[PDB]
Amino acid sequence: QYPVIGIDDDEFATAKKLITKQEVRAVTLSKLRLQDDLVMWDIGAGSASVSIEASNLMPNGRIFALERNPQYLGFIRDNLKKFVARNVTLVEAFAPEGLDDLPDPDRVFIGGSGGMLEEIIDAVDRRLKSEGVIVLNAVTLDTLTKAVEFLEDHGYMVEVACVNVAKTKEYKMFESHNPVYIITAWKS
Amino acid sequence: YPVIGIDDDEFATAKKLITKQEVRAVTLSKLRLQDDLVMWDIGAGSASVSIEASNLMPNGRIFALERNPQYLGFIRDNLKKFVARNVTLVEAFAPEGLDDLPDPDRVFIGGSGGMLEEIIDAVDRRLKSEGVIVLNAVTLDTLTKAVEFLEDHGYMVEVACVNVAKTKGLTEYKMFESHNPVYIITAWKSDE
Amino acid sequence: QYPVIGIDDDEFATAKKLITKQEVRAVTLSKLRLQDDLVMWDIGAGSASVSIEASNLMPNGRIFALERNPQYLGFIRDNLKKFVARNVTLVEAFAPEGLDDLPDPDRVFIGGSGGMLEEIIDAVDRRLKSEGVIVLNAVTLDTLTKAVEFLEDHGYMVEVACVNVAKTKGLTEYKMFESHNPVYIITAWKS
Amino acid sequence: YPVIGIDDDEFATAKKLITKQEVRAVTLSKLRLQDDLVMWDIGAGSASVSIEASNLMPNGRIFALERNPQYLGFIRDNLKKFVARNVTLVEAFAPEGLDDLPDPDRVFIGGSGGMLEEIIDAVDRRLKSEGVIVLNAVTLDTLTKAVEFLEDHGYMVEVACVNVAKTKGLTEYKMFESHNPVYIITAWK
Ligand SMILES: [Cl-]
Ligand SMILES: [Cl-]
Ligand SMILES: [Cl-]
Ligand SMILES: [Cl-]
């Protein structure tokens, strides 16, 4: 038995710095404005933690987890079978390659672009359904800069939320995670 | 409306009362919700936590306790608007009014009304096996005493300080505006 | 009767949202790598709180505070008199106009651009002394973006520090932390 | 070396010990320093706060208390490196060793070493009129207790939680890396 959202980060097969951590994952899910029956793309899925929890939010939605890295693909395989996330389909693809075969998306999360950010945004803009939402998480200045630029260029309203989290595990010292910029884009 | 992430301005609320959207999502995460559970929301305010919790537990039962008459009207209006039928609004000044409720799997404490120790004691007696208590604190006194009382009762306690800054406007002047920090306190028994 | 740095925000003649607030002001001064005998420009001075505290840190240094808003020039004239900042010269100008007549700077603080950010950065770059340091404070994404771009274009090493401050007033424990908006302090220098 | 804002890597220090430069600047700011004052730095660590405070008060008098042998090593190395002649290193564990110091105008508590309550009480009996106490706290326990004990003694307390995240100098991959939060607690009568 796992919670609907808020699965502990340690339960995912992952690498250091790869996982969308629990708290930011929850905010990311929230920004995606999910409802049942939608199609969602998770570009650069990593460990697929965002996909897995989104699948719990949309039991009859369809989630397409895209990842090109062989090590990460192994993580995802192990996770999808641990968490019984049957409405998630793993797709081996270097986005924007592999998107043409996917059904039109209501929701797109961009966890990793692999140097292809502008190309992914353009490809997604052409495919995104009416009332669609794009969410990206960014930890670097260049990705933050360029994502805001490219989304605004396509006429998206854009919100940027910078989320800082510090936690005590005794002696309770607050340890900070690095900041995550959750960028949310839609048509008004 | 989405399952979670309903815009703050869609709720009938007062200034400084609502559990704002980002922090709400983290709070629900920390609550470790699954369907069919019983949840108490003590000091419900606008009941935004109760309402999104109810979306995550369609077959669960949520009990939202609120003492303030102005906030009761907000709740009534919100429950109807968002169709949160599995939330029962309970008019009470907790720990009063907890007795008629079923034992909780999950308790969120959003407001104590000067009754923090008494609420934690009452909740601790009732809390089911593998239960989780979450509290959102914005003052240092609440943060200090909540950690102190929960640790007295043998709970494992995590504190997560969540700082959110967001842009708005439309373009050009995309300035980050900070929310005030919120301390999300999660307590559970390491035993169970 | 006033400290070297950490002068209360209230003691400056100022407008709402104008002042570089105390904590951020302190970090800004720290990033400015101040030592005595230097020339500093403070572009878009506001109330000149940055110029004033820098003046305490460099008593034998020379500071030029540029501002053209007539109201703010009043604030600066008041504040320079109140705090006895004699080594600060008020310059009535909207940068990059009014920079030509100034001595070559070792340090430049850009507190306000008036939409002339690129032109200000270009002007400053041509003039900045060896081992010089530029500091800017950005609150918008657009300023953050363009500043980093324009400074990297001119070949500077650029550090961005995002500073978040949340404070209790006065009851302290019975009293919510109130957050200031984040400030991006951008520090630029040649390696 | 600058008057304030000396790069953290220039001090002899250990992991997690130094008052990092941004927070150090805010701390000096909160200390309300002016020349000719007497300051105590209790649990001085690497003495980075005392050193930069020395620059702010050349004719002031700073007493840096430390008795961890490794940290005393760092301090001696640092004072020699930065020319901070108005800093006296005092080998002691507060509140003992405070009786040998002159009455302070300013007190920074950087490390209490389990003696927080006793330190605040001893400081309170000695602090000069218009004096300022500053403490940097990173645990909830220290935050809680400092605030309680300072208000117990009739101080007006400000707590400023400072979060700093920063990139590096290189253009390639500018990721914001967070320092842990620091609660800078300022107290005055
Ligand atoms: Cl992940
Ligand atoms: Cl609410
Ligand atoms: Cl100013
Ligand atoms: Cl130090």
CSV table of C-alpha atoms in Angstrom, one decimal, chain C residues 67-146:
chain,number,residue,atom,x,y,z
C,67,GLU,CA,19.8,59.8,-10.0
C,68,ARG,CA,17.4,62.0,-12.1
C,69,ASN,CA,14.0,61.6,-10.4
C,70,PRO,CA,13.6,65.1,-8.7
C,71,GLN,CA,11.8,63.6,-5.7
C,72,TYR,CA,14.6,61.1,-5.1
C,73,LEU,CA,17.3,63.8,-5.6
C,74,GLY,CA,15.6,65.5,-2.6
C,75,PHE,CA,15.8,62.2,-0.6
C,76,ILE,CA,19.5,61.9,-1.5
C,77,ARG,CA,20.3,65.5,-0.6
C,78,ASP,CA,18.6,65.0,2.8
C,79,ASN,CA,20.3,61.7,3.4
C,80,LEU,CA,23.9,62.8,2.4
C,81,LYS,CA,23.5,65.7,4.9
C,82,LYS,CA,21.9,63.6,7.7
C,83,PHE,CA,24.5,60.8,7.6
C,84,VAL,CA,27.5,63.1,6.7
C,85,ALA,CA,28.5,61.2,3.6
C,86,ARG,CA,31.0,63.8,2.3
C,87,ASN,CA,32.8,61.4,0.0
C,88,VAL,CA,29.6,60.9,-2.0
C,89,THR,CA,29.0,63.2,-4.9
C,90,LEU,CA,25.4,63.4,-6.1
C,91,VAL,CA,25.2,63.5,-9.9
C,92,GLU,CA,21.9,64.6,-11.5
C,93,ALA,CA,21.7,62.3,-14.5
C,94,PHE,CA,20.0,59.3,-16.1
C,95,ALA,CA,22.8,56.8,-17.0
C,96,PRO,CA,24.6,56.3,-19.4
C,97,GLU,CA,24.2,60.1,-19.8
C,98,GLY,CA,26.3,61.8,-17.1
C,99,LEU,CA,29.0,59.0,-16.9
C,100,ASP,CA,31.6,60.7,-19.2
C,101,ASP,CA,32.6,63.3,-16.7
C,102,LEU,CA,33.1,60.8,-13.9
C,103,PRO,CA,36.5,59.2,-12.9
C,104,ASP,CA,37.1,55.6,-14.0
C,105,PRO,CA,35.3,53.3,-11.5
C,106,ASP,CA,36.7,50.4,-9.6
C,107,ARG,CA,33.2,49.5,-8.4
C,108,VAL,CA,29.8,50.0,-10.0
C,109,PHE,CA,26.4,49.3,-8.3
C,110,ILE,CA,23.4,49.3,-10.6
C,111,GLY,CA,20.4,49.8,-8.5
C,112,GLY,CA,18.1,51.1,-11.2
C,113,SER,CA,18.4,51.0,-15.0
C,114,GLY,CA,15.4,53.1,-16.2
C,115,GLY,CA,15.1,50.7,-19.1
C,116,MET,CA,18.7,51.6,-20.3
C,117,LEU,CA,20.3,48.4,-18.9
C,118,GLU,CA,22.2,47.3,-22.0
C,119,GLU,CA,23.5,50.9,-22.7
C,120,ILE,CA,24.5,51.2,-19.0
C,121,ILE,CA,26.4,47.9,-19.1
C,122,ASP,CA,28.1,48.8,-22.4
C,123,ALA,CA,29.2,52.3,-21.0
C,124,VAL,CA,30.4,50.8,-17.6
C,125,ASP,CA,32.4,48.0,-19.4
C,126,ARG,CA,34.4,50.5,-21.5
C,127,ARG,CA,35.3,52.4,-18.3
C,128,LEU,CA,35.7,49.9,-15.5
C,129,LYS,CA,39.2,49.7,-14.0
C,130,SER,CA,41.4,46.5,-13.8
C,131,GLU,CA,40.1,44.1,-11.1
C,132,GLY,CA,36.8,46.1,-11.1
C,133,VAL,CA,33.5,44.7,-9.9
C,134,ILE,CA,29.9,45.4,-11.1
C,135,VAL,CA,27.0,44.5,-8.7
C,136,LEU,CA,23.3,44.7,-9.7
C,137,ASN,CA,20.1,43.9,-7.8
C,138,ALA,CA,17.3,42.4,-9.9
C,139,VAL,CA,13.7,41.6,-8.8
C,140,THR,CA,12.2,40.9,-12.2
C,141,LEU,CA,13.0,37.9,-14.4
C,142,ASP,CA,13.6,40.2,-17.4
C,143,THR,CA,16.3,42.2,-15.6
C,144,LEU,CA,17.9,39.0,-14.2
C,145,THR,CA,17.9,37.5,-17.8
C,146,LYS,CA,19.2,40.5,-19.7
